[PDB]
mmCIF file of C-alpha atoms in Angstrom:
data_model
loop_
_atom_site.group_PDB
_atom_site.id
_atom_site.type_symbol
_atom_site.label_atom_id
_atom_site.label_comp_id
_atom_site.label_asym_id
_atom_site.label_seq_id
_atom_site.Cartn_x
_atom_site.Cartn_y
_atom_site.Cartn_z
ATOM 1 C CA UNK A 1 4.987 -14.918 78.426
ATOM 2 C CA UNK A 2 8.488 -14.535 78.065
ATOM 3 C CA UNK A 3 10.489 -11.574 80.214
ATOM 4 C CA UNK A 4 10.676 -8.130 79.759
ATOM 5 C CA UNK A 5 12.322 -4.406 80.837
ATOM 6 C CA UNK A 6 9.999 -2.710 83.593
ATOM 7 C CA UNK A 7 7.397 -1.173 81.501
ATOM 8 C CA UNK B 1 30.076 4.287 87.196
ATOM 9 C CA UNK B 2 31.153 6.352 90.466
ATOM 10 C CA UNK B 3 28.384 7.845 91.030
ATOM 11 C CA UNK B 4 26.460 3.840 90.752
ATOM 12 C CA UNK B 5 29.662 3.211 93.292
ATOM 13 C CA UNK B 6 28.227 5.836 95.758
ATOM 14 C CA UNK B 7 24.135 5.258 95.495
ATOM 15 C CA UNK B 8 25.459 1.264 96.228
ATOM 16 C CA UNK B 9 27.370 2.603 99.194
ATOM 17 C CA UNK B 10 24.839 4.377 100.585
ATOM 18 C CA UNK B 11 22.111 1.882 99.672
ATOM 19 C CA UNK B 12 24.809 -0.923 101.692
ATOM 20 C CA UNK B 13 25.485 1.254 104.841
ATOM 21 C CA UNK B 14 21.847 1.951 105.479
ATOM 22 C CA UNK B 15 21.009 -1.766 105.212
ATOM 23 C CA UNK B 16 23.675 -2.184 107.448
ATOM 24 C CA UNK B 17 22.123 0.243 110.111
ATOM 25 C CA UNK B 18 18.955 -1.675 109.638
ATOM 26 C CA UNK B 19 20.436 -5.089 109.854
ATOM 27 C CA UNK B 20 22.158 -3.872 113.325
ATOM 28 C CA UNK B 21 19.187 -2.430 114.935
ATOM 29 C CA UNK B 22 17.420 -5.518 113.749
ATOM 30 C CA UNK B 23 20.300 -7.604 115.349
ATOM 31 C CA UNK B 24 19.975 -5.892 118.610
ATOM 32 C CA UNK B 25 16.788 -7.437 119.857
ATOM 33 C CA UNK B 26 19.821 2.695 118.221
ATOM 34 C CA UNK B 27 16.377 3.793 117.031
ATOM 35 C CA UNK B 28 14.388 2.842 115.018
ATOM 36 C CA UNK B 29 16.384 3.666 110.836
ATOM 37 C CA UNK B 30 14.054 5.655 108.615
ATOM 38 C CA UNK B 31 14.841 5.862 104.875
ATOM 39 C CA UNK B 32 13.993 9.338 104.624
ATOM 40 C CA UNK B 33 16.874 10.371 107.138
ATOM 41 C CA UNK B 34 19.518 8.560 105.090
ATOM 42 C CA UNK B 35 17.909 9.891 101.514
ATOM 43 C CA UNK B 36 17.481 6.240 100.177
ATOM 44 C CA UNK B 37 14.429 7.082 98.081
ATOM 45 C CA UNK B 38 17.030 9.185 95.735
ATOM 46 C CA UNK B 39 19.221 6.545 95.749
ATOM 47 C CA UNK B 40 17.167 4.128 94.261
ATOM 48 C CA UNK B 41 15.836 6.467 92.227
ATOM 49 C CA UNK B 42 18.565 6.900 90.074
ATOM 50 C CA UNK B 43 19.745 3.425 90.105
ATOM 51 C CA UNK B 44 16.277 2.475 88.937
ATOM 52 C CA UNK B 45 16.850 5.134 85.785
ATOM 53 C CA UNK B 46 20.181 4.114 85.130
ATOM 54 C CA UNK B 47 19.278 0.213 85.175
ATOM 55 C CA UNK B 48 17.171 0.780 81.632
ATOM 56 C CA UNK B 49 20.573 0.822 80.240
ATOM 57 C CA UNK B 50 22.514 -2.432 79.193
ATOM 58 C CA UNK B 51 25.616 -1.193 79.714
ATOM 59 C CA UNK B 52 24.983 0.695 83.053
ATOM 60 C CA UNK B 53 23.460 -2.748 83.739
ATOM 61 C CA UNK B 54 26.757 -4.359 83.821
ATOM 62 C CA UNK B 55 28.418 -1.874 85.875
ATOM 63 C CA UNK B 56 25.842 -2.180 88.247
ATOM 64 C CA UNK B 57 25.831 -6.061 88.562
ATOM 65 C CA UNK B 58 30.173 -5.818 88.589
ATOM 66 C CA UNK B 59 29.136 -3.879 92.173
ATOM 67 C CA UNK B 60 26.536 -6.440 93.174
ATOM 68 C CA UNK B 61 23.506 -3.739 92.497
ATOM 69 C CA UNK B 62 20.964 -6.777 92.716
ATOM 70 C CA UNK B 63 21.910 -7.837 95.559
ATOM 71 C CA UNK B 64 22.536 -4.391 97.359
ATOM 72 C CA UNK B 65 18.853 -3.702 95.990
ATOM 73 C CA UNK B 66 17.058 -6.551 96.844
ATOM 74 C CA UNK B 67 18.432 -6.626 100.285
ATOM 75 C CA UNK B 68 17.174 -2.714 100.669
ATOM 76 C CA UNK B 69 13.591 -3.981 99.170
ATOM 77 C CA UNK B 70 13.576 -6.902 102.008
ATOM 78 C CA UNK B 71 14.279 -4.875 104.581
ATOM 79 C CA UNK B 72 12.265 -1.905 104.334
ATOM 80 C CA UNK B 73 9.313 -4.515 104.047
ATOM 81 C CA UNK B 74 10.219 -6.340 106.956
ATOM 82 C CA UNK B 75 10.405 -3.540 109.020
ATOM 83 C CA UNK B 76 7.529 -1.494 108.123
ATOM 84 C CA UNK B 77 5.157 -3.776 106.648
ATOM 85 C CA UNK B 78 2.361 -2.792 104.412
ATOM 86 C CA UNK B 79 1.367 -0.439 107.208
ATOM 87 C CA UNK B 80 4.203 1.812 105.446
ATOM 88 C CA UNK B 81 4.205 5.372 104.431
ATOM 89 C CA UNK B 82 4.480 6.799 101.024
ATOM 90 C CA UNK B 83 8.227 7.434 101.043
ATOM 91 C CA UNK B 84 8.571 3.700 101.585
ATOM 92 C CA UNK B 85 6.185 2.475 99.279
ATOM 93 C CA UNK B 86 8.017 4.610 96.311
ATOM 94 C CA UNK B 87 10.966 3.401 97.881
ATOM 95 C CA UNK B 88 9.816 -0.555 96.793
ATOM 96 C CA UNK B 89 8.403 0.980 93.934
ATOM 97 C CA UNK B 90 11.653 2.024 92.638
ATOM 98 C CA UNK B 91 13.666 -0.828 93.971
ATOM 99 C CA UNK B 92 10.892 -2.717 92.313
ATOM 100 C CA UNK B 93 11.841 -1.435 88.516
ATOM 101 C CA UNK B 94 15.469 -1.661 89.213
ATOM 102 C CA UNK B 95 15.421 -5.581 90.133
ATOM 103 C CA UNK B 96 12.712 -6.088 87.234
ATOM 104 C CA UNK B 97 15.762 -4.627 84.915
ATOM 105 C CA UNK B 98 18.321 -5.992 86.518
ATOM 106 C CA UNK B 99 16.527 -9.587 86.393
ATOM 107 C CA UNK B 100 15.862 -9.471 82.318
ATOM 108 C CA UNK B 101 17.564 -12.139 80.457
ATOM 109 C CA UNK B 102 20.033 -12.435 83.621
ATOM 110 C CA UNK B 103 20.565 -15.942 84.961
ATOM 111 C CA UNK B 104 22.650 -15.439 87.508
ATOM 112 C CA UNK B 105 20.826 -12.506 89.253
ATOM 113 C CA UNK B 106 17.176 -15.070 88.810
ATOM 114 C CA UNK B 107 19.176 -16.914 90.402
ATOM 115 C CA UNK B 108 20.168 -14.993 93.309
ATOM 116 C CA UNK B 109 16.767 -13.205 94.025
ATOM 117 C CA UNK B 110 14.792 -16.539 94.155
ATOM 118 C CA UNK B 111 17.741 -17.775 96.830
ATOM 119 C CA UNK B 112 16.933 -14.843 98.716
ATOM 120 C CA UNK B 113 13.618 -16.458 100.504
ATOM 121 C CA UNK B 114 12.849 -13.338 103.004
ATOM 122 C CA UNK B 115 13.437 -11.190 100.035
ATOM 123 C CA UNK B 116 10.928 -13.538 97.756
ATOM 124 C CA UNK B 117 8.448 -13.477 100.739
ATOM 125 C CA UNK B 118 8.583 -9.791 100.830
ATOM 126 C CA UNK B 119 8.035 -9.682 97.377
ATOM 127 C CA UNK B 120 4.661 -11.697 97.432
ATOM 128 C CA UNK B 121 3.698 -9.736 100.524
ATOM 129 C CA UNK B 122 3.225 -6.764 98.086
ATOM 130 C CA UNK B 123 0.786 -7.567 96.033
ATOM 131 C CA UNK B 124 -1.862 -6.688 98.573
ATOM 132 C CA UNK B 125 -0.234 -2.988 98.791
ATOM 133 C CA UNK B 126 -2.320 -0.004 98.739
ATOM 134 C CA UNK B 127 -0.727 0.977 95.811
ATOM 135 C CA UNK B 128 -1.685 -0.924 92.375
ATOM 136 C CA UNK B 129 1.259 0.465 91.074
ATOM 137 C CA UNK B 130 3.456 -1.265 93.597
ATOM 138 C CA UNK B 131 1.750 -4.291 92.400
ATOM 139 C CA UNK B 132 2.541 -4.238 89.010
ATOM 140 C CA UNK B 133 5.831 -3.871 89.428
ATOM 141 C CA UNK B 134 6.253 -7.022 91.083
ATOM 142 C CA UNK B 135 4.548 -8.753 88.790
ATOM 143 C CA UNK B 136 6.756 -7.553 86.270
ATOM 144 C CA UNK B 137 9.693 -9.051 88.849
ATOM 145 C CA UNK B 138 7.996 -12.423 89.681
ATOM 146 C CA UNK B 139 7.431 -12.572 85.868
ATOM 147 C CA UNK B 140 10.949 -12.500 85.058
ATOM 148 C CA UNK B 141 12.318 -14.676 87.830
ATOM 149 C CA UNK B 142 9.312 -16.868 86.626
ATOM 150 C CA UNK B 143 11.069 -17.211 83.480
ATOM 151 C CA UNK B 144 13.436 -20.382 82.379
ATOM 152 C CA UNK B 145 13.851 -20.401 86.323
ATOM 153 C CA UNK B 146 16.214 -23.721 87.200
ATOM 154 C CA UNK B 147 15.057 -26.287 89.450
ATOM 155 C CA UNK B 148 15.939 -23.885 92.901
ATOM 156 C CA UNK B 149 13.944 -20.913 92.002
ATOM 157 C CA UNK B 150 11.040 -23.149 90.774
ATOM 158 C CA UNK B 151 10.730 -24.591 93.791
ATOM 159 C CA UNK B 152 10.934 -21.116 96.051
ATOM 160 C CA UNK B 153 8.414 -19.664 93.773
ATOM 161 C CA UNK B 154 6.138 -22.288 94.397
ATOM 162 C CA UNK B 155 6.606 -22.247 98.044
ATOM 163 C CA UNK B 156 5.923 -18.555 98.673
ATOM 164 C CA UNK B 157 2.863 -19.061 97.583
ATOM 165 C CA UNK B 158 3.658 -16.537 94.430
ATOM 166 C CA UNK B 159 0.473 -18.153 92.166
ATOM 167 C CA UNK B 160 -1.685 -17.681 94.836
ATOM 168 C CA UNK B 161 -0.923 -14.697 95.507
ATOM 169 C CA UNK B 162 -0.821 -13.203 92.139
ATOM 170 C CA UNK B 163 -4.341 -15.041 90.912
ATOM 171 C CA UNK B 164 -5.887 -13.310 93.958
ATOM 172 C CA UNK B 165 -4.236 -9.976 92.810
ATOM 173 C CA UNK B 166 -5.817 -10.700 89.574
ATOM 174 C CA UNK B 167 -9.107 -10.724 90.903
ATOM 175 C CA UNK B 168 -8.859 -6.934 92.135
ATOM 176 C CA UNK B 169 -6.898 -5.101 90.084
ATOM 177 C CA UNK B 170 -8.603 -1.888 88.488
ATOM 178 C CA UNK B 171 -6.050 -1.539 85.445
ATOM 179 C CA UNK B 172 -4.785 -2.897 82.103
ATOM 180 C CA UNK B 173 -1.171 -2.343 82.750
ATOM 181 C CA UNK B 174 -1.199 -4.489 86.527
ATOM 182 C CA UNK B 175 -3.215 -7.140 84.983
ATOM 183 C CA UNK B 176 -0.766 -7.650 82.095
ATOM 184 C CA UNK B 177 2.194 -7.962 84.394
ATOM 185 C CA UNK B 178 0.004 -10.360 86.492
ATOM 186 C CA UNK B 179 -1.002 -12.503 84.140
ATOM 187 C CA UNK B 180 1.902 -12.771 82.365
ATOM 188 C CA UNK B 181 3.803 -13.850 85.673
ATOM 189 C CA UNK B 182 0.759 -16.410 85.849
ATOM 190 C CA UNK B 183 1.344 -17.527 82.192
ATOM 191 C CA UNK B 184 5.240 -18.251 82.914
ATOM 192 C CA UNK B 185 4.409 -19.766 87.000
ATOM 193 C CA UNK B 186 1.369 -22.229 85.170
ATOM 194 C CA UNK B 187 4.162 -23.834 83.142
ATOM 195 C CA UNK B 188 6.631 -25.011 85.944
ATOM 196 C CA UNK B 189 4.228 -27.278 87.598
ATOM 197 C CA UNK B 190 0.984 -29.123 88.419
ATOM 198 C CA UNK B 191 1.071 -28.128 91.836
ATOM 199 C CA UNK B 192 0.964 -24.445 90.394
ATOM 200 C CA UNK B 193 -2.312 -25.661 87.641
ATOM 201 C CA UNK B 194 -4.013 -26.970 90.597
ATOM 202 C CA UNK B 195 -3.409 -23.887 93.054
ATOM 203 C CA UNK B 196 -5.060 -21.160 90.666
ATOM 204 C CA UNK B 197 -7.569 -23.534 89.499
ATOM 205 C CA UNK B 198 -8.440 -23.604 93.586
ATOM 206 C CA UNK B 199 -8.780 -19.467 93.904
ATOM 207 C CA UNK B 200 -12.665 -18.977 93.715
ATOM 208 C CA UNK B 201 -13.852 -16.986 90.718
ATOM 209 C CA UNK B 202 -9.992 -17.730 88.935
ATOM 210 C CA UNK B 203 -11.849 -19.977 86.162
ATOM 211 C CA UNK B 204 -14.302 -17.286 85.391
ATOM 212 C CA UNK B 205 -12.164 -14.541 85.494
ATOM 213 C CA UNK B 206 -9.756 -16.031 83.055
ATOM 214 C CA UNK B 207 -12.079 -17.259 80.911
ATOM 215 C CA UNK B 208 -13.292 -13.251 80.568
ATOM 216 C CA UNK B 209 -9.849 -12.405 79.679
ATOM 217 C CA UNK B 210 -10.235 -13.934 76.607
ATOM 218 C CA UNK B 211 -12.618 -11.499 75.457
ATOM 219 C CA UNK B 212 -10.656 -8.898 76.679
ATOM 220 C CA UNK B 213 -11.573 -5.467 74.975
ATOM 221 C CA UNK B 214 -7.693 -3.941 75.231
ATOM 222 C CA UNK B 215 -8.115 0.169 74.694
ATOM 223 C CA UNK B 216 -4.147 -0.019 73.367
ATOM 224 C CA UNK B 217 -5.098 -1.894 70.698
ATOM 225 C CA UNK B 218 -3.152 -4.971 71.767
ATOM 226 C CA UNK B 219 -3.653 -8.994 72.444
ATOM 227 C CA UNK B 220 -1.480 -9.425 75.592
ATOM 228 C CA UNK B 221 -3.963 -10.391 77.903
ATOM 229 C CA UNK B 222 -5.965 -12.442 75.663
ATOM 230 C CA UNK B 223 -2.610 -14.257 75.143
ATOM 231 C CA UNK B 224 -1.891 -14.376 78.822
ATOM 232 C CA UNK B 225 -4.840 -15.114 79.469
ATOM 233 C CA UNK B 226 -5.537 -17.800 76.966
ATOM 234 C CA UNK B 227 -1.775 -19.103 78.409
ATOM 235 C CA UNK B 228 -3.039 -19.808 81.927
ATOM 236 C CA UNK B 229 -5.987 -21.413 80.406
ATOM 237 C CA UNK B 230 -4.079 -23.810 78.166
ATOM 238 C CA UNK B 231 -1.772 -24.838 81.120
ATOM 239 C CA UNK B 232 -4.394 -25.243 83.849
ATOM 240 C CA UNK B 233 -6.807 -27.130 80.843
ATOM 241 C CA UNK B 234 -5.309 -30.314 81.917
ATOM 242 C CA UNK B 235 -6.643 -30.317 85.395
ATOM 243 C CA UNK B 236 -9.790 -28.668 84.197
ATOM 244 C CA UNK B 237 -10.744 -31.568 82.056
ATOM 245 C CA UNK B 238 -10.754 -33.748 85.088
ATOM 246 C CA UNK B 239 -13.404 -31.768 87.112
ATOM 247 C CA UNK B 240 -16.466 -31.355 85.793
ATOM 248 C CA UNK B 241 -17.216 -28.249 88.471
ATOM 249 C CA UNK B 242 -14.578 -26.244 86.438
ATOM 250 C CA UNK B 243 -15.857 -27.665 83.000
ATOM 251 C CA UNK B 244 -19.234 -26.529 83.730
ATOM 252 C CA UNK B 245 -17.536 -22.710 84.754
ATOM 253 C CA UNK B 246 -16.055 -22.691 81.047
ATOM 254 C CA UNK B 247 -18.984 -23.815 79.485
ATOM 255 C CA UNK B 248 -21.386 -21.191 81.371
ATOM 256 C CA UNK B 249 -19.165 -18.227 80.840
ATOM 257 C CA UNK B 250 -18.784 -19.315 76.750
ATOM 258 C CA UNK B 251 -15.079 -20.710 76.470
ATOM 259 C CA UNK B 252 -15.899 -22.888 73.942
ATOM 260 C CA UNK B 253 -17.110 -20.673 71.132
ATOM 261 C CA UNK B 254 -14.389 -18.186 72.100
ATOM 262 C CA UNK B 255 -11.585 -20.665 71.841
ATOM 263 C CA UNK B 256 -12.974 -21.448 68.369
ATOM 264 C CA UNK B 257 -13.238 -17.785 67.308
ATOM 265 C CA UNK B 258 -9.179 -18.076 68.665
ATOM 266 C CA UNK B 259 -8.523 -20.531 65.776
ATOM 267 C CA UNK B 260 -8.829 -17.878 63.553
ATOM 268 C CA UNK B 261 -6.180 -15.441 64.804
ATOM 269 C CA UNK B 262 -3.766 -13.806 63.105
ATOM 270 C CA UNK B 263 -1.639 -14.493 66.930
ATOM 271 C CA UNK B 264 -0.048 -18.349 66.495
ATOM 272 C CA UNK B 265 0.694 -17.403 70.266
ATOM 273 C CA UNK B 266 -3.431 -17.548 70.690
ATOM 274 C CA UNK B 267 -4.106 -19.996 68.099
ATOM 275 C CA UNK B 268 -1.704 -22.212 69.691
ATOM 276 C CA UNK B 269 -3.209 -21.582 73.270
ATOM 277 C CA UNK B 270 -6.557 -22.238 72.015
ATOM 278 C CA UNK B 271 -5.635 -25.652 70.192
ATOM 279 C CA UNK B 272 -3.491 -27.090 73.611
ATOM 280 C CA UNK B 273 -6.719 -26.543 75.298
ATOM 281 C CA UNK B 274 -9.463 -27.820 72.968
ATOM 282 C CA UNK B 275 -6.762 -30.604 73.049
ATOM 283 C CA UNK B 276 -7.438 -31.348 76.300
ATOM 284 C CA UNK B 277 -11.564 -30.467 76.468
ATOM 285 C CA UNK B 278 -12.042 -32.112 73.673
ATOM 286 C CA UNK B 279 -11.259 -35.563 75.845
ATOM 287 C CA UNK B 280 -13.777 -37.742 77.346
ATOM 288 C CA UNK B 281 -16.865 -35.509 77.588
ATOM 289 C CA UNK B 282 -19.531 -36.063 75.588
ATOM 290 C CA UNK B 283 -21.360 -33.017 75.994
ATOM 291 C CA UNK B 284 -18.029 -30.822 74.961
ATOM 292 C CA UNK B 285 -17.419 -33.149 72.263
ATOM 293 C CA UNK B 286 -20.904 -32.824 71.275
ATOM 294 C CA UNK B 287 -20.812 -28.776 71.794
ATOM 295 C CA UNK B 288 -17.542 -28.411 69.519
ATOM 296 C CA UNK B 289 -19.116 -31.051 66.279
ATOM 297 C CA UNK B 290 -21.853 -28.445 66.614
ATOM 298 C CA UNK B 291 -19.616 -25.498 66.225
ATOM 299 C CA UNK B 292 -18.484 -26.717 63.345
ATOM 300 C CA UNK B 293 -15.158 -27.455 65.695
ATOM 301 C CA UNK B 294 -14.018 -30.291 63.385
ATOM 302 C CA UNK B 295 -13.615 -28.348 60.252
ATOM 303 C CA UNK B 296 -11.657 -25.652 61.898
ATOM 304 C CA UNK B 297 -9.195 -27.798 63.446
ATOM 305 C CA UNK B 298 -8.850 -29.686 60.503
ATOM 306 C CA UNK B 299 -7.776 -26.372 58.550
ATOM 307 C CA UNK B 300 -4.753 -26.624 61.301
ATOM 308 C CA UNK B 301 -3.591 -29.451 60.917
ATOM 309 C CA UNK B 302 -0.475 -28.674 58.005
ATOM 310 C CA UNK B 303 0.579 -25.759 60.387
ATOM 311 C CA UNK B 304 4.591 -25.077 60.271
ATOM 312 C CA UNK B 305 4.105 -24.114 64.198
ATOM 313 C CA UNK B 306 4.674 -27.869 65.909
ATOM 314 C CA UNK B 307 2.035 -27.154 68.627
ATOM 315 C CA UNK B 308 -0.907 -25.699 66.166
ATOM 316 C CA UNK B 309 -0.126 -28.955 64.273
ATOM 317 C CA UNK B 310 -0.036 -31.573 67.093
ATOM 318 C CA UNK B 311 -2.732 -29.679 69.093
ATOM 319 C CA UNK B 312 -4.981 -29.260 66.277
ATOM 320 C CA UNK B 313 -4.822 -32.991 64.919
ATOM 321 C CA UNK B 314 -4.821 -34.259 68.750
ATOM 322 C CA UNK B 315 -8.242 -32.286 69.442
ATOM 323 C CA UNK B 316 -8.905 -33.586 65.545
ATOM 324 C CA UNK B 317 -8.913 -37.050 67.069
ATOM 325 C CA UNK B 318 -11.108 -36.726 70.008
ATOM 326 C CA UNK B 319 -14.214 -35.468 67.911
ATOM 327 C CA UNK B 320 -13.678 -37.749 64.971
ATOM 328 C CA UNK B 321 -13.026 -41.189 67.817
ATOM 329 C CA UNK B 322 -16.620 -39.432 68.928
ATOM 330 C CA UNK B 323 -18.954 -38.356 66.722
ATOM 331 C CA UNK B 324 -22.502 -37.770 68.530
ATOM 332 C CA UNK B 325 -25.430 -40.353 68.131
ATOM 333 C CA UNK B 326 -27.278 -37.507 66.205
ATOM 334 C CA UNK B 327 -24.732 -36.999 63.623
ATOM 335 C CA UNK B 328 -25.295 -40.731 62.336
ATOM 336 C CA UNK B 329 -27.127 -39.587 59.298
ATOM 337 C CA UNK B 330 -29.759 -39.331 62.259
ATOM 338 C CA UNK B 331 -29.850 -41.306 65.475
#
């Protein structure tokens, strides 16, 4: 899934 | 970077206020009298930034956060008011920013266990919204976490917690976050396969999400989705309760119809878990040669992606070692 910036 | 200097302050000297009264068992603190929900407000904005980022963490900002987030929860609860819940809301963003790509503040949070506990406790909050955020957090700290935050994120109960979440969420955007959390917590162990393999209706439910009909024309649960499957698919091929739950809710043509996508994320999904279907059971073996399963793995098999290729060739094996009595010309 990997990580990510609040979206 | 005064101004981040003076939201931290005031974010530090009301958990301070809080950690006395706590201490002492002087009323009871209430956010709203020290204007926290502000506070965090802009920090949240200002932590989209990279380089407002890094002046933040030189002050300690996930830390300061995080220790606001814990404490609010632990003194209200989830039988909170609104000003609290967009409180954790916005605390919520600001450690999912602060937590990107960041190994030291991973780290941290997942050290902080009361804080991690508090975390969890929100996904059953009233607001949906609330939950998606953490998701987003746990999804991060669920990512490349060393051997320490593994562990703490197992013991939480964090896969639990956010399968059940799953279950009954109403929108698109908290069941991304969710799953993808899922996706990154199904990788770290068996004890996590086994745990949302044991949520009733988990099987079923992720089976639908590769189906999924996404109205933003995108594949992110189907890949999350198809994820969880291909890490839990190793347990599942050892019970034939949860076989039979796959079977009855179509996995197998789906995974097929998966071999075909343009994603290598859900092609590769799909072959890791016909990889492990595909062994020992002759009625899945039997299901997939009438699929025409062999021929479209085959087509796989010269794939530059390492895990299409070994996946592929691996599920390959188990349907060529087992080809069923009818195939044999007849008989």
């Amino acid at each position: 899934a990997g990580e990510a910036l609040y979206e | 970077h005064h101004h981040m200097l003076h939201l931290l302050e005031q974010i530090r000297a009301y958990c301070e206020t809080c950690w006395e009264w706590q201490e002492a068992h002087n009323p009871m603190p209430a956010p709203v009298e020290h204007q926290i929900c502000p506070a965090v407000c802009v920090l949240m904005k200002l932590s989209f930034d990279e380089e407002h980022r890094h002046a933040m963490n030189e002050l300690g900002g996930l830390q300061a956060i995080a220790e606001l987030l814990q404490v609010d929860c632990e003194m209200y609860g989830l039988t909170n008011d609104h000003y609290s819940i967009t409180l954790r809301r916005y605390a919520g963003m600001a450690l999912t920013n602060l937590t990107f790509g960041d190994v030291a503040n991973k780290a941290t949070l997942c050290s902080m266990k009361g804080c991690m506990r508090a975390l969890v406790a929100q996904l059953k909050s009233e607001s949906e919204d609330l939950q998606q955020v953490i998701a987003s957090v746990l999804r991060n700290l669920s990512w490349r976490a060393d051997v320490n935050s593994k562990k703490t994120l197992r013991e939480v109960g964090s896969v639990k917690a956010l399968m059940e979440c799953a279950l009954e969420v109403k929108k698109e955007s908290t069941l991304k976050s969710v799953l993808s959390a899922l996706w990154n917590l199904s990788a770290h162990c068996t004890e996590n396969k086994a745990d949302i393999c044991a949520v009733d209706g988990a099987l079923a439910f992720l089976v639908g999400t590769l189906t999924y009909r996404s109205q933003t024309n995108t594949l992110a649960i189907i890949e999350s989705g198809g994820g969880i499957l291909r890490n839990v698919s190793s347990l599942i091929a050892t019970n034939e309760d949860h076989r039979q739950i796959l079977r009855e809710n179509n996995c197998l043509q789906t995974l097929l119809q998966h071999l075909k996508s343009h994603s290598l994320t859900i092609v590769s999904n799909a072959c890791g878990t016909l990889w492990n279907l595909s062994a020992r059971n002759p009625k899945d073996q039997e299901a997939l040669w009438d699929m025409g399963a062999v021929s479209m793995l085959k087509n796989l098999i010269h794939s530059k992606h390492k895990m299409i290729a070994m996946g592929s060739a691996a599920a390959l094996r188990n349907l060529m070692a087992n080809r069923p009595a009818k195939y044999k010309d007849a008989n």
